[PDB]
Motif scaffolding. Structure first.
Motif, PDB file in Angstrom:
ATOM      1  N   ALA A 172     -58.808 -55.190  13.599  1.00 50.72           N
ATOM      2  CA  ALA A 172     -58.441 -54.851  15.066  1.00 50.72           C
ATOM      3  C   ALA A 172     -58.319 -53.512  15.367  1.00 50.72           C
ATOM      4  CB  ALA A 172     -57.212 -55.572  15.426  1.00 50.72           C
ATOM      5  N   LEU A 173     -57.547 -52.864  14.400  1.00 46.93           N
ATOM      6  CA  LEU A 173     -57.286 -51.168  14.666  1.00 46.93           C
ATOM      7  C   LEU A 173     -58.761 -50.543  14.718  1.00 46.93           C
ATOM      8  CD1 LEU A 173     -54.451 -50.504  12.432  1.00 46.93           C
ATOM      9  CD2 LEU A 173     -54.253 -51.178  14.851  1.00 46.93           C
ATOM     10  N   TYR A 219     -59.994 -66.232  26.223  1.00 42.54           N
ATOM     11  CA  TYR A 219     -60.989 -66.746  25.325  1.00 42.54           C
ATOM     12  C   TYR A 219     -60.241 -67.307  24.206  1.00 42.54           C
ATOM     13  CZ  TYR A 219     -64.319 -65.805  21.337  1.00 42.54           C
ATOM     14  OH  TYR A 219     -64.955 -66.432  20.460  1.00 42.54           O
ATOM     15  N   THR A 220     -59.215 -66.992  23.783  1.00 47.53           N
ATOM     16  CA  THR A 220     -58.575 -67.889  22.370  1.00 47.53           C
ATOM     17  C   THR A 220     -58.155 -69.435  22.918  1.00 47.53           C
ATOM     18  OG1 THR A 220     -56.496 -66.641  22.794  1.00 47.53           O
ATOM     19  CG2 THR A 220     -57.929 -65.787  20.997  1.00 47.53           C
ATOM     20  N   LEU A 278     -60.206 -51.046  18.160  1.00 49.64           N
ATOM     21  CA  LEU A 278     -59.362 -50.282  19.112  1.00 49.64           C
ATOM     22  C   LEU A 278     -59.979 -48.832  19.081  1.00 49.64           C
ATOM     23  CD1 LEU A 278     -57.270 -50.176  21.129  1.00 49.64           C
ATOM     24  CD2 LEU A 278     -55.640 -49.511  19.643  1.00 49.64           C
ATOM     25  N   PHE A 305     -53.090 -56.807  21.801  1.00 50.83           N
ATOM     26  CA  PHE A 305     -53.870 -57.586  21.086  1.00 50.83           C
ATOM     27  C   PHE A 305     -53.441 -58.824  20.200  1.00 50.83           C
ATOM     28  CE2 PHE A 305     -53.900 -53.859  18.076  1.00 50.83           C
ATOM     29  CZ  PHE A 305     -53.892 -54.754  16.960  1.00 50.83           C
ATOM     30  N   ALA A 313     -55.321 -64.166  13.365  1.00 53.03           N
ATOM     31  CA  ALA A 313     -54.159 -63.281  12.926  1.00 53.03           C
ATOM     32  C   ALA A 313     -53.142 -64.221  12.772  1.00 53.03           C
ATOM     33  CB  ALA A 313     -53.796 -62.073  13.753  1.00 53.03           C
ATOM     34  N   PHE A 343     -63.677 -56.744  18.903  1.00 49.32           N
ATOM     35  CA  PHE A 343     -63.630 -56.584  20.116  1.00 49.32           C
ATOM     36  C   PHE A 343     -62.316 -56.987  20.833  1.00 49.32           C
ATOM     37  CE2 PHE A 343     -68.431 -56.803  19.935  1.00 49.32           C
ATOM     38  CZ  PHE A 343     -68.374 -55.450  20.056  1.00 49.32           C
ATOM     39  N   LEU A 344     -61.311 -57.527  19.771  1.00 50.54           N
ATOM     40  CA  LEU A 344     -60.044 -58.049  20.284  1.00 50.54           C
ATOM     41  C   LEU A 344     -59.638 -59.055  20.956  1.00 50.54           C
ATOM     42  CD1 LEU A 344     -58.676 -54.353  20.866  1.00 50.54           C
ATOM     43  CD2 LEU A 344     -58.835 -55.594  18.637  1.00 50.54           C
ATOM     44  N   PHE A 345     -60.641 -59.563  21.614  1.00 51.98           N
ATOM     45  CA  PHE A 345     -60.819 -60.746  22.502  1.00 51.98           C
ATOM     46  C   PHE A 345     -60.370 -62.218  21.461  1.00 51.98           C
ATOM     47  CE2 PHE A 345     -65.391 -60.489  22.260  1.00 51.98           C
ATOM     48  CZ  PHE A 345     -65.462 -61.624  21.510  1.00 51.98           C
ATOM     49  N   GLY A 346     -60.725 -62.034  20.351  1.00 48.69           N
ATOM     50  CA  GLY A 346     -60.282 -63.286  19.438  1.00 48.69           C
ATOM     51  C   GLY A 346     -59.425 -63.089  18.407  1.00 48.69           C
ATOM     52  N   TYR A 347     -58.456 -61.935  18.625  1.00 52.37           N
ATOM     53  CA  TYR A 347     -57.618 -61.611  17.566  1.00 52.37           C
ATOM     54  C   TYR A 347     -56.525 -62.646  17.258  1.00 52.37           C
ATOM     55  CZ  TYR A 347     -53.967 -58.819  14.981  1.00 52.37           C
ATOM     56  OH  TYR A 347     -53.436 -58.350  14.098  1.00 52.37           O
ATOM     57  N   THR A 348     -55.740 -63.280  18.160  1.00 55.24           N
ATOM     58  CA  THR A 348     -54.827 -64.272  17.810  1.00 55.24           C
ATOM     59  C   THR A 348     -55.274 -65.354  17.061  1.00 55.24           C
ATOM     60  OG1 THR A 348     -54.927 -64.463  20.178  1.00 55.24           O
ATOM     61  CG2 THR A 348     -52.908 -63.328  19.297  1.00 55.24           C
ATOM     62  N   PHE A 353     -55.927 -57.404  10.708  1.00 53.58           N
ATOM     63  CA  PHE A 353     -55.324 -56.130  11.425  1.00 53.58           C
ATOM     64  C   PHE A 353     -56.040 -54.940  11.282  1.00 53.58           C
ATOM     65  CE2 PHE A 353     -51.961 -52.850  11.151  1.00 53.58           C
ATOM     66  CZ  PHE A 353     -51.612 -52.806  12.311  1.00 53.58           C
ATOM     67  N   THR A 388     -66.779 -59.629  14.392  1.00 51.02           N
ATOM     68  CA  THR A 388     -67.177 -59.203  16.047  1.00 51.02           C
ATOM     69  C   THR A 388     -65.957 -59.792  16.873  1.00 51.02           C
ATOM     70  OG1 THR A 388     -68.750 -59.344  17.755  1.00 51.02           O
ATOM     71  CG2 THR A 388     -68.743 -61.071  16.016  1.00 51.02           C
ATOM     72  N   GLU A 389     -65.287 -60.794  16.594  1.00 52.09           N
ATOM     73  CA  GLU A 389     -64.482 -61.430  17.259  1.00 52.09           C
ATOM     74  C   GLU A 389     -62.985 -60.514  17.243  1.00 52.09           C
ATOM     75  OE1 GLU A 389     -65.063 -65.452  16.482  1.00 52.09           O
ATOM     76  OE2 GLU A 389     -64.259 -66.014  18.102  1.00 52.09           O
ATOM     77  N   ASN A 425     -49.244 -64.176  19.716  1.00 54.91           N
ATOM     78  CA  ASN A 425     -48.865 -64.547  18.496  1.00 54.91           C
ATOM     79  C   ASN A 425     -47.455 -64.692  18.257  1.00 54.91           C
ATOM     80  OD1 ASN A 425     -51.195 -65.776  17.301  1.00 54.91           O
ATOM     81  ND2 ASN A 425     -51.813 -63.949  16.161  1.00 54.91           N
TER      82      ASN A 425
END
Lengths: 333, 333, 333, 333
Positions: free
Chosen positions: C313-314, B295-296, C317, D293, C299, C291-296, C310, C287-288, D297
DNA sequence: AAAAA
DNA sequence: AAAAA
DNA sequence: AAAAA
DNA sequence: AAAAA
C-alpha cells in the motif's frame, strides 16, 4: 476641413454604426471641445490632437464620430458618451476610458496598447476576435464588455442569414474573451480576473452550442453529430455553471467548504429523521460517507438506507470535484 | 532590374525549393500585379513594395519566388498560391495570409511578427525549430501547418542518409509546435488551441520515436536503450491518444462523463446478463465499483464475478485519470 | 588603437578572468581574423565590427578578450574558443553561439536578447542572477550551462571567506536557472525544457542546502533552525531526485507505468514465493493493494502477510504521487 | 533655476507627501551631490542628469524631492534615503535601488521598467494598482514593499471617511501584489517568489475582508450579504494561513511530510497510551487511518476509539489537501 | 540544425 | 472573419 | 481609483 | 550580489 466618410461606416453591413445613407463627408475636428460639448459626424485624427502630455477629455457626447491614426500621446476620456462611434483604423497607447458609455460602437480593426476601461457601460458594441487587439489592456468589467456586444443583423444582405451571423459572433466573443483573460493574468484586481474567468467559460460554452446549431442547420451523419455536439455543450454548460456557482469560479475555498457542510448536514438530518439515528453520530456517518473513506462500513445492498448512502457518496464525489481545484488555485499561482 | 539567385535555393539541399539548376538571376519585382497574375523566378523586396498603408495582394499565383527584407507595412495575401517560394531572409510584421495555399515553400530563416495564417492549405512546406520565429503569430490551423511539413530527402548528398534527415525533422516539428502552442495561449479560438495541443502532443511522441530509432540505428547497451526508448514512446503514444480521444484533449468534461456512463452501463449490463442482477442495482454496483469507493463490498477472491469486478475497478481508475485533468482545465485557466 | 583594461578584469576579484597583474592596455580590434586566428588581450567593440548583415566568426580562439557595446547586428560564432573572456558591459541581439567552448569566462553585466547557445561546452564560467539578463535566450544545454559555472575563490580577500562565496553562488545559479526555465517555456525542444526542469530543481535544493549551511556557520536557536533547514533540504533533495528519476522529471507517463508494473510484479512474486499464492491472482492481489482500492479486503493486523500488504500500500501511495503529475503535465500544457 | 510645485504634493490629499503648505517653488537640481549630501524641496528632472552611461548616486538623503521625466540612462541608488519623495510622473528604465530607505514616498503615476529594488526598507510608502506600472521589475522583498504601504488618512476632506480609504487601499495592495507576482514568475530568487505568494494571498484575503466590511457599513439583504462575505473571508484567511504555514506556501514537500509524520506519531501515541496498543503497530494503525486506505478496518460506530479514528481520518484528509499541491508545484513548473 | 537580408 | 490608418 | 511628465 | 558600456 473635411474628409471622406469611411467604408467601414457606409459599406461594412456587419458593423454596428453601419449607415448606407451616411453623409459623404465628415468634419475634421480640431479637438476643441470648449464650444461644442457634442460633436457630430466628425473625424478625430491622431495627428490633429493638441500638443499635450496628457489630454483630458471630459463630459463629451460623441455621436457618429470616427477615430483614426496612432494616438501615441496619453488621452483620458472622463464620463464621455460614444454613440455609433468607430474606433477602427486606430492604435491607442495608454488611453484611459473612465466612466464612459459605449452604444453601438465598434472596436474592430483597432489596437488598444496598454489601455484601461474602468466603470464603463457597454451596449450593442462590436469587436473582432483577431482584429481587435488588446495588448496589455485592462478591461475592469470583462463580463459587461464581452456580453454587451452583439452582431448587428438588420443589414444582412440576401443570400446570407441572421442565424449564422449571430452564432459566429458567439465564437468571436469566445476568442476575444480568451485574449482578455490572458491580459488579466498579469493585471487587474482579483474580482476582475474571476469575472473574466466566468465570462470566458460561459462564452466558450455558448460558442460550442452555436457551432453545434450551425452544424445542425447545415447528411444524416452531420445532423447526428451536430445534435450530439449540442447536447454535449448543453451538459457542459450545466456542470460548469453549477461548479463555478458552488466554488466562486475557483476563487473561494470557504464557499466550497460551506456547501460541503450544508450537504453533509442535510444528509445527516435525513438519517436522524428517517432511520432514528442520534444527531451526534448521524453527522459522523454523513461526513464519513461524504468523504468516501467510510463508505463500505455503511453501504449494504438491499438495506433501507442504501439508496441514501449511495446518494451521499455521489454528493461527496461531486464535492471533491468542486473543491479540489479551489485548493489548487489558492495554493498554486 | 535583376538580382542574384540565393544560395538557399541553389545550395541548401535540405530546402523544399532546392534546385541546383535554378537560373543565376531573378527578376526584381516592382509589385505590379495588374499585368501578370503569376510571377515566376522573381524576387520581392520589402524596400520595393508600393507606398501603401495596407497592400492587398489577391489571387496571385507565385512560383519559384523569393521574399527578402523587413516587411514593416501591412500586407494582406488573399487566396494566393505559393509554389516553391522562399520566405527566408525576411521579417514580416502583421502580415495576413487569408485562404492561401503553400506548396514546397520554406519558412526557415524567417520572422513572422504578429502575423496570421487563416484558412490556409499546406503541403510539403518547411520550417526550422529555431530559425522560424513566430512571435505573437496566429496559425489558425496548427495541425495542418505542422503536419503539412516534411523534410526534403531527394537531394541528400552521399555520406548523409535519408532516415536521419526525416527523423530529425520530427524533433524540428515538435519544437516549432511548442512555440506555436505558447503563441496560442494568448490568442486564437478554443478550437485552434486544442488542435494545437493535439498536434504538439503527437509531434512530441513522434520525435521520441524518431530519436529512439536513431539510437537503434547507430554497443549492445546503446541498442537496448534505443529499443526501450522506442517501446516507451510507442506506449506513451497509445495512452496519450486514447486519453485525448476520450476527453477531447482536455477540452470537454461532458465527453468524459459520457464515456464513463457508457462503461458503467456496459459493466452493469454484463452483471445483469451473467449473474442475474436486476438492472436497477446492477447499475448501482457498476457505479459503486467504477468510482472505487464501494469496491471492497463486492470484491472477493475466488468468486465468479471477481474478475469482472476487478476489471470494473480498473476501468474506473483509467476513467479517473481521463476525467480529472478535464475538470482541472475547465476550472483552472 | 588601444584602450584601458577594464576594472572587471583587474579589480573585481569575484570574476573568473580576474587578474590583478593584467596589462594596463588592451589592443582595440578591427575584427579582421584573416591574419590572426587567436586574438590576445583584445577589446572587441560593437561599434567597430565590419558592416555586415550577418557576421560569421569561425574557428577563432579568443583568450583574455573583452567585448563591449550594443551588438545589434547579427553575429554567428562557429566553433570558437573563449578563454578568460569578458562578455560584460555588452548587449548582444540575436547572437548565435554554435559549437563554442567557454572557459573561465564571465556573463555578468551582460544582456543576451534573443540569443542562442547550441552544442556549447562550459567550464568555470560565471554569471549573475540579476545582472546576466537572458530575455528570450535559448540555452540548448541548460544543465551544462548552469553547472559548468562556479564561484572563483582563490582571490577572496581577507575578512571574507571561501565558503560564503560558494554557497551564495548556489543561490545565484538557482535564480538564473529560474530565468532560463521561464525562457524555455516559449521555446526550445522538449528535451531542453526537461533538462532545464531537472537543473532548476537540483539548483533550488542545492541553494536551500547552502543557505542552511550558512545559517549553521553563522545563538543556539539559529543553529537549531539551520540544522533543521539543512535536514529538510536534504530530504527534499532525496524525494525530488527519486520522483524525477522515476518519472523523467514529469515527462514520460510510460516510465511511471513501468515502475508501477515492476513494483507490483515484485510484490506479487513475494506473495507467490512466501504465502503460496498462485501467480494469476498474486498479481491481482498486488495490483489490488497497490492502487489502494482493495486494501481492506486483504489487510488484517496480526496476520503473516500484514507487513507485506502495508508495504505494498505504501508503494502504491508513492507511485500515485509519482504518476499523477506526469498525467497532469501530458494533458495540461 | 526653479519650477512650480506639483499638484500631486499640494492638492492630492491621498498622497503620502501631501502638504497644503508646501512652498510654491522647488529648486531645479543640476544633479551635483558633491557639495550637498541632502537635497531639500528639489526637482530632479531626467533631462538634467549628467551625461553618463551609469550614474551612481550614493549616500544621498532626499527629503521633499520630486522626480520627473523619462530616466532612460541607468541610475544606481546606493544606500540613499527618500523621505516624502514623489517619484510620480516619471518612467525609470533599469534603475537599481540598492540598500535604500523609503519613508512616506509615493510610487503612483510611475513606470518602473526593468528596475530592481534590493535590500530596501519601506514604511508609509504609497502606490496605485493601475498607475504604478512595474513591467519586468524585480522587488527583492515583496512582503516588505507591499505591507510597508498604507493609505494616508489625516488629510481626508469632509464628506469622505477614513475607513473607506483604508479598506479600498487593501484592494489596491492586492492588485499591485498580483502584478508583482506575475513579474516574479520570470525572475528573482525562489525565496522572493514564495514571499510574494505569501504576500499576495494575504493581501487578497485582506481585501475580501475590507470589501465585506464596506458592504456592511453601507437594506437588510445587503447587511446579511456583507456579514456572510466577511465570515467567508475570515474562514479563508484561517485555512490559507494554516495550509501555507504547514507547507511553506507551496515550497517544501519535506515540511508537509514532517507535519504528517508528527500528526501520525501523536495519534499513534494516543492509541498506545489509551487503548493499550504496542507502539510497533499503533504506528501502523495511525498511518493506515491517516492515509485513509485502511480506515474501514478500524472504524466501528459505538467503539471506544471510534472518535479518535474519525479524527485521525480527518487529519489525514487535511494533510492530503496540504501535501498534494506541494508535490504538484515541485513536479510541475 | 544547417542557412546568414 | 470580413475590413484595410 | 483619484492624479495627468 | 558586488560591478557600472
Amino acid at each position: 476641413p473635411s474628409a471622406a466618410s469611411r467604408g467601414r461606416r457606409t459599406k461594412n453591413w456587419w458593423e454596428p454604426m453601419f449607415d448606407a445613407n451616411a453623409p459623404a463627408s465628415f468634419s475634421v475636428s480640431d479637438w476643441n471641445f470648449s464650444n461644442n460639448r457634442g460633436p457630430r459626424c466628425t473625424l478625430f485624427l491622431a495627428e490633429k490632437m493638441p500638443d499635450a502630455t496628457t489630454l483630458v477629455v471630459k463630459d463629451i457626447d460623441f455621436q457618429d464620430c470616427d477615430f483614426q491614426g496612432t494616438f501615441e500621446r496619453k488621452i483620458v476620456f472622463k464620463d464621455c458618451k460614444f454613440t455609433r462611434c468607430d474606433f477602427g483604423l486606430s492604435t491607442f497607447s495608454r488611453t484611459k476610458f473612465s466612466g464612459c458609455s459605449f452604444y453601438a460602437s465598434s472596436f474592430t480593426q483597432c489596437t488598444l496598447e496598454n489601455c484601461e476601461f474602468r466603470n464603463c457601460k457597454y451596449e450593442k458594441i462590436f469587436y473582432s476576435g483577431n482584429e481587435t487587439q488588446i495588448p496589455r489592456t485592462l478591461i475592469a468589467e470583462p463580463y459587461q464588455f464581452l456580453f454587451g456586444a452583439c452582431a448587428t443583423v438588420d443589414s444582412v444582405p440576401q443570400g446570407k442569414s441572421r442565424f449564422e451571423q449571430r452564432a459566429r459572433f458567439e465564437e468571436t466573443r469566445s476568442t476575444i474573451a480568451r485574449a482578455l483573460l490572458a491580459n488579466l493574468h498579469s493585471e487587474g484586481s482579483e474580482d476582475t480576473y474571476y469575472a473574466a474567468v466566468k465570462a470566458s467559460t460561459l462564452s466558450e460554452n455558448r460558442a460550442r452550442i452555436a457551432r453545434a446549431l450551425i452544424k445542425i442547420n447545415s447528411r444524416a451523419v452531420s445532423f447526428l453529430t451536430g445534435f450530439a455536439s449540442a447536447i454535449s455543450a448543453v451538459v457542459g454548460m450545466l456542470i460548469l455553471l453549477v461548479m463555478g456557482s458552488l466554488n466562486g469560479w475557483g476563487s473561494s475555498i470557504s464557499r466550497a467548504m460551506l456547501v460541503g457542510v450544508v450537504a453533509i448536514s442535510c444528509v445527516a438530518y435525513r438519517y436522524h429523521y428517517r432511520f432514528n439515528l442520534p444527531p451526534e453520530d448521524a453527522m459522523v456517518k454523513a461526513t464519513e460517507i461524504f468523504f468516501l473513506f467510510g463508505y463500505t462500513n455503511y453501504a449494504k445492498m438491499g438495506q433501507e438506507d442504501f439508496h441514501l448512502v449511495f446518494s451521499n457518496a455521489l454528493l461527496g464525489l461531486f464535492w471533491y470535484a468542486i473543491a479540489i481545484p479551489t485548493i489548487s488555485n489558492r495554493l498554486t499561482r
